[PDB]
Design a protein around this ligand. Structure first.
Ligand SMILES: [Mg+2]
Ligand SMILES: [Mg+2]
Ligand SMILES: [Mg+2]
Lengths: 525, 525, 525, 115
């Protein structure tokens, strides 16, 4: 197709106009006095939300250049939420602030590459200052507190999360399910988790979390690339008769095979999801057998001469639940015999003794930790179904917050950590004046979150920002109560991972956009 | 269809506006401080790239005359990348410079043909100066250094390439594959490479390299022209069942047969690729049998009275991997018996003794070299899959660079070699004044790459260009560190083949466009 | 008023468009087969003319930038006719040729200043070649021949001019008047000529010659600047009563005095003309008194305390005729007594004896030569009034041609001298390549007159131009008879002064116009 | 002082370390210093040479060494006879900076309506 090509300043304003629509739409929801955004759906009454992520996904613009601007920031800002479970809105507001001031500097005739180098240097410095400011979260008391604060001052949730992490450890796998009554439950079962997400976003059946949940699914384990649907017809038909959903773990599922499975699930003739097998090379083959023993299936390797057409139900493994998101796949309560699993574990602990390399023993130690460790399952209870679903959501949300808090600690929330760190970097310089401006752009952008929160509350951003800079440490402005004090004590905090991730991702896309000289897109019509 | 016909200056300025859009889009990415180009994809977030080739592929213009101008330069500039693995962007920038100053001269009333002949004379001279400036790359130490510089200062890559070239020789065949762990591997297997590319660009399944990669494919050996799919059906259905891809090597595939195999591969009902059989006449028939023995298939020759309908999947040979690009086809790890291959080799060596002509001996000697020589296979290892894929890419890229360096040597990079060579040709003259201008057009165009690189850095092109002309040899301006010195020593270099190819191709299309008086295209509606 | 301001190329193409309208209108008339131009006047039937000067005067354009272009070339091209009595059309066609090729070079990116210096060098060289090519015109035989050729092959005119030049010398003053019968007359009378023209072009009452002709006028001699008309009223009224024209010779006539006299003459209440007194300083005062003695008037000097209000009719001198053009004033047949004039002459010759300086003696000798020498008066006779006026015109025109021929000689006409001189300057070079182009622009422009003449004849310019370059000396193409030969022998010649003046004036403006970067004019409003 | 616009570029080169009370003033300084090259560059541009290259070489030297634009050679500008009265160069700069300063600090303009 014939393309529309824009250059230089003409192109960069277009992108800025686009990011502004995204940012301005999402940033109204920021802080304790955040505003509602109304999202239209033409099947019923419109949605009213204060979720910046929900707003962001809806944003698509007519002007194709403006749209490209919005989609770039969306893409990168969403990676903040993937990592830490929060800070897409923050990342978007930061991105807007860095780009705006960055482009002002470019128009003033400063070198884009130096501006980027200055921004990046300010960020690297700021991240270390966040490390320094961070309060650790180690003991189970602290864990319960962070879980409580994350779950809207609900102490039951803090206790649940603390008890769960006490059983399977800090780096254990924890799941949340629907409860079967009033009482909460906690059980550890045979399970596993590997870092491979869905191969298509159209598999998502729980759009709120952005995840694929399969109840009592069969699991296909193939040691090959599936490109055609021809070879999976006898297996798909055998799964349809049993009327159970199917997970496919293969080397890759692409081309016609992927497309057919995407459409079938959306029509709803068979519910299916596909993920890549974990790892690569020889280690992949080994981990594909680990899940085989766990689920009680057999790997269909074409290497020793097995075909997918001669795969029956008995070859597929099964679990009680599978949960897939953009990055991770969790397998919950496999039907593997304790004999087979404990044998596989003993077999790997044999190989650790015979291992020559340190790299080999740490990789084998990962695999044993998965099989031996299992998975914790929290079943959230409540009086009604409505309360149960609501609490579950808060538990999942607080779980991700607490996990992040354990990794990197907590810092003052309400956009205070960023403004604190920025105030400590006044004397930071670069190689030239252009880089110095790049630094000052970044430092000034780190105030954007606080100011927006304060603006939503109806207070003067400049005055509050001014007072917060006056203090030191985790002293800041509680936007909810309109009082100053220790932010951690007052219970207004963010995981350090959230604030860090939000800043680095924001600076990533901002840096790229500032150093863009050309854009290519399809023609208006 | 009724045509739109433009003439003379009116036509030439349309072309120039087209080449400008292409060149201006691609040339922003040039140099170490090269800018980003954003390429839109209406299925997700847009691509951000500094790859001039990626940008060039996208460029298509609405105005049919402007488009023709862009497509002509794209076509020719891409041939530079095909030959040397670099310098499409350089060729485009050169072309723009030659055409711009060429059309100035045509408007000043100078004969286009003389301008062309002057340009061509300056280029032939410049290529000879590049040979003189070139530092050879012969010993294994040097091969490692060039491989290291090409792979972003990674000594492990230089070492890999050097070891691979030590195994099979400088004229040897070298492949790169995915690794199976942390360790790198180097193995020589039964294989062959011949100079025949894909018969349709629509067969490309790895668009990054611009190549078709078939894993464990069947290979069809036909000694005829396949124009219809009717005769292909019994064979296509027998490979669709085995669920493996298919390479066809015939005298030619065209017409109905080609079109059907294009659309089938795109839809993904069967993955298929097609290439012509190597050579022509009697020697083609012989080389088809060489591939048959290697791959363990049987040639389906209609001359002895075999039909393609009666072909079975026993007749097809198979290999572990096939890699085809625009010019070459590589068959990797054939399943041929060593008894059969060594027998074929002995049979060829017999013919060398019976050969009367020198030409016959040389042709038979390059057949034995293919069978006996085999193919090197570098499996690139890393810790993570992401790191492995990334390193593999750098190895493939460095391999191409090093191959080119071995052929013709290396010269100062950063656009210095061209400006150096141009400075040595101040006294070059032609048959008349018009040719003299043609020379000065070319010499002045050879500065375009350096100036653009310096412009992207934010420095004054004129001043840098001025200083670089002052010195001699491979003294130039390192654009990354902003210091002058020996460019080869500082590690900023290009294969002489790249710079040569870029200039010659650039001057080719420029010369044709300058001497265009008429353009014919379909009318807008 | 607010101004329209144009720059660079935009301004220079406007000027060229304007020069084209002028040149194209005038150049059709060039040569023996020159075309008619029809000039509209809204008081009768339109004029049909082949006089390029008549055409030029009419040309004024609506676009103010185009107009400026035309007016610049007109202004200087007219100076050629002022000097030599021919070659305004030639100067215009040359200017067009130099500007056209000059602006092509400027757009090709060559330095305007160098182009000008190259043009100027080519012209200085060409003028030297014209002097070498020039055939002298000294002896009385040659005078008659040139006069005959100039007067349309009329031998009576040639004799008349020769006899006149024999009487008063080669540097003598010669007038032409209407005859009183059939016979011609030649008389030498008391008169003078000085190099001061009309102070306003609106005094012109003979528009064909572009001259002021007053019959039996009074002459006012004032040794002051006249700015106000109030001091002129008693003198103007006295002149209006006598019903005779008035010539005013003052230090200067400017401001309100000039304006009032311009309007009064155009109304026709008093016919009056004004010129500056000749020379400056002490030399001026002396020469005013020379004119006073000649005309029998009194100098009104405010130095000795005379006022212009107390000036009566007796104070004004008178002559039988005064003829004023753009450069010269001629006083013909003054009413000064022979006693007073011879007395003034004797008085000056006395001062020559007392003179110490050689410069002083030469200046005094000039003044004596004017008074003692007088003025020749040719009365042209014919059978009818119509024939008389017609012949009188040819005599005036041939007189100017012959005067010019005496000064600098004759060269081949028909545009041959220019093309000959250009052919001898092929190896002329400058300080750089830009100057070299400037030279070639000029040399190529020198062909424009010939080619235009040949084009008007309906022959091929390139062929004729080619043949003429083949020969040497004053060999050329007689456009009238379509035969080659010695142009002087065939009687097709131009005064060397004409060709020289035409070229120098053409190159003058062409140079200035090429080196113009900005134009300022009033708004279209 | 040295003419051809080299006196202004010379003194601008000596004032690289000049700073003010804040960053905004520092930019104001660099604006002025960079503006002092405008005359030379324009002279060189009119000659058809590269302003950047000539400006560069002139900064390299010291004193009244500069580029004679007429003869296209470098040397002592006073010796070569290309000079300006110090009063001219001074006056031109001060008056230029006067009106520039006023215009930069203009926030409102009042004039009669177009019609
Ligand atoms: Mg969250
Ligand atoms: Mg390459
Ligand atoms: Mg005349």
């Amino acid at each position: 197709a014939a393309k529309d090509v824009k250059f230089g300043n003409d192109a960069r304003v277009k992108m800025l106009r686009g990011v502004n629509v995204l940012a301005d739409a999402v940033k109204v929801t920021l802080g304790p006095k955040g505003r509602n955004v109304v999202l239209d759906k033409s099947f019923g009454a419109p949605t009213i939300t204060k979720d910046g992520v929900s707003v962001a996904r809806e944003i698509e613009l007519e002007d194709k250049f403006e749209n490209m601007g919005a989609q770039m920031v969306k893409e990168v800002a969403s990676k903040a939420n993937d990592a830490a479970g929060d800070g897409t809105t923050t990342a978007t507001v930061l991105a807007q602030a860095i780009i705006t001031e960055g482009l002002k500097a470019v128009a003033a005739g400063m070198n884009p590459m130096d501006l980027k180098r200055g921004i990046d240097k300010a960020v690297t410095a700021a991240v270390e200052e966040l490390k320094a400011l961070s309060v650790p979260c180690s003991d189970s008391k602290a864990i319960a507190q962070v879980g409580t604060i994350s779950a809207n001052s609900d102490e039951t949730v803090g206790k649940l999360i603390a008890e769960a992490m006490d059983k399977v450890g800090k780096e254990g796998v924890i799941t949340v399910e629907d409860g079967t009554g009033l009482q909460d439950e906690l059980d550890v079962v045979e399970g596993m988790q590997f870092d491979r997400g869905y191969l298509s976003p159209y598999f998502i059946n729980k759009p709120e979390t952005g995840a694929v949940e399969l109840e009592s699914p069969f699991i296909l384990l193939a040691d090959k690339k599936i490109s055609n649907i021809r070879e999976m017809l006898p297996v798909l038909e055998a799964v349809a008769k049993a009327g159970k959903p199917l997970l496919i773990i293969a080397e890759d599922v692409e081309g016609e095979a992927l497309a057919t499975l995407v459409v079938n699930t959306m029509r709803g003739i068979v519910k299916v999801a596909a993920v890549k097998a974990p790892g690569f090379g020889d280690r992949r083959k080994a981990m594909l057998q680990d899940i085989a023993t766990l689920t009680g299936g057999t790997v269909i390797s074409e290497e020793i001469g097995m075909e997918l057409e001669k795969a029956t139900l008995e070859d597929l493994g099964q679990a009680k639940r599978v949960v897939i998101n953009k990055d991770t796949t969790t397998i919950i309560d496999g039907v593997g015999e304790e004999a087979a699993i404990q044998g596989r574990v003993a077999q790997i602990r044999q190989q650790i003794e015979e291992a020559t390399s340190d790299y080999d023993r740490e990789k084998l130690q990962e695999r044993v930790a998965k099989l031996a460790g299992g998975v914790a399952v929290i079943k959230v209870g409540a009086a009604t179904e409505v309360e149960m679903k609501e609490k579950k959501a808060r538990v999942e949300d607080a779980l991700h917050a607490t996990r992040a808090a354990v990794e990197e600690g907590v810092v003052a929330g309400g956009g205070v950590a960023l403004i604190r760190v920025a105030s400590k970097l006044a004397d930071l310089r670069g190689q030239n004046e252009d880089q110095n401006v790049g630094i000052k752009v970044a430092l000034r952008a780190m105030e954007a979150p606080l100011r927006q929160i304060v603006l939503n509350c109806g207070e003067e951003p400049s005055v509050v920002a001014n007072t917060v800079k006056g203090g030191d440490g985790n002293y800041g402005y509680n936007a909810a109560t309109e009082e100053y004090g220790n932010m951690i004590d007052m219970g207004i905090l963010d995981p350090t991972k959230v604030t860090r991730s939000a800043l680095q991702y924001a600076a990533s896309v901002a840096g790229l956009m500032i150093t863009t000289e050309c854009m290519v897109t399809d023609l208006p019509k």
